[PDB]
Amino acid sequence: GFARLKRSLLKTKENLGSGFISLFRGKKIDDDLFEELEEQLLIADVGVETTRKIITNLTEGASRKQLRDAEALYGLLKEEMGEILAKVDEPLNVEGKAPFVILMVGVNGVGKTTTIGKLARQFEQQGKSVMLAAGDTFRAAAVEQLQVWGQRNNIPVIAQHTGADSASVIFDAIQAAKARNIDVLIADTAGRLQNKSHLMEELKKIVRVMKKLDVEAPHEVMLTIDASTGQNAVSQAKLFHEAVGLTGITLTKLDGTAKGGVIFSVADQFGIPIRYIGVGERIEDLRPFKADDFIEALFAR
Ligand SMILES: [N+]
Ligand SMILES: [N+]
Numbered sequence: 001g002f003a004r005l006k007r008s009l010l011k012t013k014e015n016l017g018s019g020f021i022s023l024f025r026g027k028k029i030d031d032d033l034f035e036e037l038e039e040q041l042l043i044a045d046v047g048v049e050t051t052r053k054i055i056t057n058l059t060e061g062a063s064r065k066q067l068r069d070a071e072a073l074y075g076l077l078k079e080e081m082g083e084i085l086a087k088v089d090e091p092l093n094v095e096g097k098a099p100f101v102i103l104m105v106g107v108n109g110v111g112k113t114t115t116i117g118k119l120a121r122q123f124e125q126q127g128k129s130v131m132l133a134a135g136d137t138f139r140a141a142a143v144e145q146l147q148v149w150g151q152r153n154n155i156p157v158i159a160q161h162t163g164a165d166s167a168s169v170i171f172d173a174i175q176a177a178k179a180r181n182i183d184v185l186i187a188d189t190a191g192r193l194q195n196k197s198h199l200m201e202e203l204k205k206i207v208r209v210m211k212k213l214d215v216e217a218p219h220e221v222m223l224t225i226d227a228s229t230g231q232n233a234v235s236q237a238k239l240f241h242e243a244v245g246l247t248g249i250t251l252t253k254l255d256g257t258a259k260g261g262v263i264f265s266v267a268d269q270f271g272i273p274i275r276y277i278g279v280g281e282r283i284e285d286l287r288p289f290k291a292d293d294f295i296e297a298l299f300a301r
Contacts, residue, residue: 002296008279012260015044017298027070044261085291103218108191117149133173133187134159200243252278
């Protein structure tokens with residue numbers, strides 16, 4: 001539903017999508033125009049490298065089509081920015097594994113635990129059996145939050161004492177999931193960026209332990225990032241992807257932020273599928289990402 005998404009993206013539409021119309025009105029296509037467009041893309045948090053790529057491709061496309069009027073750049077931009085998102089438009093498919101293991105990674109303070117609970121409830125409402133692993137083992141509040149989701153939804157939560165070894169919790173959870181014929185296992189993890197090497201080594205150890213039980217696990221390594229944090233979301237994605245290897249992204253807090261343009265930077269810089277976008281705080285506001293809906297909402301005029 002592109003039309004539902006329009007309200008969520010209003011603040012982002014001030015600079016991107018329909019926000020381009022006033023910039024192009026009555027203008028010719030020249031270096032000054034492309035400089036104005038660069039400024040607007042950057043203020044929208046599209047990022048230096050992705051902005052340069054967009055401008056380069058737009059310039060080449062306009063020249064090849066022999067466009068005269070800047071108004072005609074709008075459709076080329078819609079296509080080119082749409083292609084950026086189309087390259088990461090693969091939905092997450094959790095079917096057919098015993099269990100399908102989602103390792104949730106990211107920094108503290110981006111809502112990883114709440115996102116896990118929302119996804120778990122969604123998979124359960126779809127008829128899948130879910131289990132949760134409380135792998136953020138030194139943060140009692142994170143463990144308790146996961147246990148709240150599990151208790152109210154009759155979803156099992158595997159946890160150990162505060163300070164337990166994360167890899168051992170997740171190992172025990174995979175064993176329990178296999179014993180109990182679970183369809184989907186979602187594992188929380190630590191997120192302290194104070195010691196980056198320690199965090200990445202802990203995640204790598206978790207992955208090695210999983211692989212001993214099922215060489216296909218983890219089936220998804222999902223990053224959660226917060227769109228309202230702007231370029232911090234991009235730097236977080238780079239850290240986890242270069243160190244561990246991501247296979248999916250959930251981007252939260254897109255509603256009301258004018259920094260929604262960061263989705264283009266995340267998509268272009270890393271090429272990792274964007275699985276879900278958050279457009280509100282409720283379970284139902286965590287939506288499967290549809291790049292074409294997103295572009296249509298952004299560029300609606
Ligand atoms: N319950
Ligand atoms: N993978």
